[PDB]
Amino acid sequence: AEPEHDHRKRMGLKMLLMMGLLLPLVYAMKRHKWSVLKSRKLAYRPPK
Amino acid sequence: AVSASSRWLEGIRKWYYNAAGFNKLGLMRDDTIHENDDVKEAIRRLPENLYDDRVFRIKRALDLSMRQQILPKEQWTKYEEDKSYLEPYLKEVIRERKEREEWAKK
Amino acid sequence: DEDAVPTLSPCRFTGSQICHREDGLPLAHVAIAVEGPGWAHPDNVALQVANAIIGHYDCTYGGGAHLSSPLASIAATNKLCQSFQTFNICYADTGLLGAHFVCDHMSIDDMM
Structure with a gap:
């Protein structure tokens, strides 16, 4: 029914291991760029 | 005049304000x-x-x-302090549109 | 002479932005600088050579298109600018090195 079964799962491990690397790293990249905004301070200084 | 019913009507209004x-x-x-x-x-x-x-x-x-x-709870806008600053501008804008719409009827 | 002097502590530079947005004002002012070295440092001279190449501009200069500086030439041709200036402000062991400019609201992105 499924000759691909063994290859599918070897690929499956390789995916999860890569995603375990790539997901935190891309997250750290998005956190880096978004830092500028997430730590921004506003002040309102109207006349009088 | 109006006392007990008014505060409850206000209470549901104030409750909803906080839930909003x-x-x-x-x-x-x-x-x-x-x-x-x-x-x-x-x-x-x-x-x-x-x-x-x-x-x-x-x-x-x-x-x-x-x-x-x-915000910290200190700095939340209190229902009692909420200024309806747009309402009289908006009401007048609506009144102006409605007059144009009546003139357009005739 | 006598006890308690301080010498000057070194001043940390921070890569940062302050943005005073004021739309009531007719022209934008932008100043941008990297960390210069101090007064003492020999490479102030070569930085000044470089700053002279970029130069200064003002809307009352003769020469639009023909000015040697490519910033000055393009700013004049494309109307990017009312003025710009390079600067190398020196303090003890630190500085402000870069540029200031004054322009229309629709010209800041091009000027940068």
Whole structure:
């Protein structure tokens, strides 16, 4: 029914291991760029 | 005159105000209004002081919404202190449109 | 002469932005600088050579298109600018090195 079964799962491990690397790293990249905004301070200084 | 029923009517209004939660972001009621044509005209008519206060309040709220944070409880807008600053501008804009619409009928 | 002097502590530079948004004002002012070295440092001279190449501009200069500086030439041709200036402000062991400019609201992105 499924000759691909063994290859599918070897690929499956390789995916999860890569995603375990790539997901935190891309997250750290998005956190880096978004830092500028997430730590921004506003002040309102109207006349009088 | 009116005492006991009024405070309960006010109580449901105050309850809903807190559950609405725009006050956690420092928004007034009139800051949250959907900008149709009537509303955009009302903004345009606002005096300098009120216009600029409105923008700062939106900015501070969008900033909080981005960080998924809210103000400290001290700094939430109190239902009693909520200024309906747009309403009389908006009411007049609506009154003006409705007169044009009556003239267009005849 | 006598006891308690301080010498100057070194001043940390921070890569940062301050944005005073004021739309009532007719022209934008932008100043941008990297960390210079101090007064003492020999490479102030070569930085000044470089700053002279970028130069200064003002809307009352003769020469639009023909000015040697490519910033000055393009700013004049494309109307990017009312003025710009390079600077190398020096303090003890630190500085402000870069540029200041004054322009229309629709010209800031091009000027940068």
